[PDB]
């Protein structure tokens, strides 16, 4: 009882967002709270922000 079936494949590019569940390999899991601008990041003497 069907005529024809149309399958449409949608590719979603989900960027990292506040709330996305990010977790390391050692059981440390956390939700991203804020996407802090790079100028606000702690930088070492070399200037590379973490």
């Amino acid at each position: 009882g069907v005529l024809k079936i149309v399958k449409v494949y949608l590719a979603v590019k989900r960027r990292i967002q506040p709330g996305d569940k990010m977790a390391g390999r050692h059981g440390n899991k956390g939700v991203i709270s804020k996407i802090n601008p790079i100028e606000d990041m702690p930088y070492d003497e070399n200037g590379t922000p973490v």
């Binding site: 590019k13 960027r15 100028e39 930088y43 003497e45 200037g47 590379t48 922000p49």
Partner: protein, 221 residues
């Protein structure tokens, strides 16, 4: 008080230089260095690519024969190229390549004003003998980072996330100066890292204008 000046600009490498400001007193050194670093990393007018059209690629996720990698990796490599323009705020770059060989940025049919500062930046590798890729790269100036999902037509147009940020690593050091006769004077050296699209002197001078204008809320120029 004392006025910092462009005492020296040590262009140590093609990408990153070492600018020096000489006259500064207690606090000024660190304050001015941190303010300049934040202004540079926050809002510096870059000229990153923002829109790409391929000759025969329908969408971002398809693949044309003869190319080493996906079109998505081609777009991400395109985002990485450092390009600076002089006159036009908007410019369209046409890339036509044929035959086996990596498609570096050097083969881009540049206009009179637009020029690639890193011609060695590879975009894609052509593999088949009769493999040709023809892309129309749309490059426009801008400030900060704006993704393609938060902006504003044909199905064949591909959107690449904009990365208008010439600077990538700004490090400043505050150390004592070598004035003729005085103490408590420090020199500020900024180890700014750029992709090559901005002159460190004009970048520093622009950052100060942005800070001075923001300061103008409480100070008459």
């Amino acid at each position: 008080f004392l006025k910092p000046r462009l005492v020296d600009i040590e262009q140590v490498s093609s990408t990153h230089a070492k600018v020096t400001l000489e006259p500064l007193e207690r606090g000024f050194g660190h304050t001015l260095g941190n303010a300049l670093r934040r202004i540079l990393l926050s809002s510096m007018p870059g000229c990153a690519v923002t829109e790409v059209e391929i000759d025969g690629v329908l969408h971002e996720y398809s693949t044309k024969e003869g190319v080493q990698e996906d079109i998505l990796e081609i777009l991400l490599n395109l985002k990485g190229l450092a390009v600076r323009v002089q006159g036009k705020d908007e410019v369209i770059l046409t890339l036509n390549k044929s035959g086996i060989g990596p498609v570096t940025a050097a083969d881009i049919t540049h206009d009179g004003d637009v020029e690639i500062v890193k011609p060695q930046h590879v975009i894609c590798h052509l593999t088949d003998e009769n493999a040709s890729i023809s892309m129309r790269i749309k490059v426009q100036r801008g400030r900060g980072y704006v993704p393609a999902s938060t902006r504003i037509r044909p199905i064949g147009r591909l959107l690449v996330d904009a990365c208008y940020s010439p600077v990538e690593r700004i490090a400043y050091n505050v150390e004592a100066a070598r004035v003729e006769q005085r103490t408590d004077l420090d020199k500020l050296v900024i180890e700014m890292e750029t992709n090559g699209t901005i002159d460190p002197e004009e970048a520093i001078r622009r950052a100060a204008t942005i800070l001075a204008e923001q300061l103008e809320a409480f100070v008459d120029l």
